[PDB]
Design a protein around this ligand. Structure first.
Ligand SMILES: [N+]
Length: 107
């Protein structure tokens, strides 16, 4: 599954609902701490509509537990990320991923 650890609290009241667009900043890393992707480096927030499976399952389920303004560390198991096949060249097979995610706003 996905484990959500708070780094900084959000408002503790506004939680993403299916169909809303989540605007976040994130940094993805492999178990060893090696960064593989980051919207922060591109200085451009990432957007995705909750429930449309435009992102890995661990995000859909983990971000739904965050409130607006919150920054959290999500630890995601392979089955909730890229599985046995992974994404050759970037994500190895059976990789557990760690994401530092900040929920900026909802649209
Ligand atoms: N995959």
């Amino acid at each position: 599954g996905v484990q959500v650890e708070t780094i900084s609290p959000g408002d503790g009241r506004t939680f993403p609902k299916r169909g809303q667009t989540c605007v976040v900043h994130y940094t993805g890393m492999l178990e060893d701490g090696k960064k593989f992707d980051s919207s922060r480096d591109r200085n451009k927030p990432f957007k995705f509509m909750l429930g449309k499976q435009e992102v890995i399952r661990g995000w859909e389920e983990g971000v739904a537990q965050m409130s607006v303004g919150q920054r959290a560390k999500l630890t995601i198991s392979p089955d909730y990320a890229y599985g046995a096949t992974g994404h050759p060249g970037i994500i190895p097979p059976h990789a557990t991923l760690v994401f530092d995610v900040e929920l900026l706003k909802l649209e």
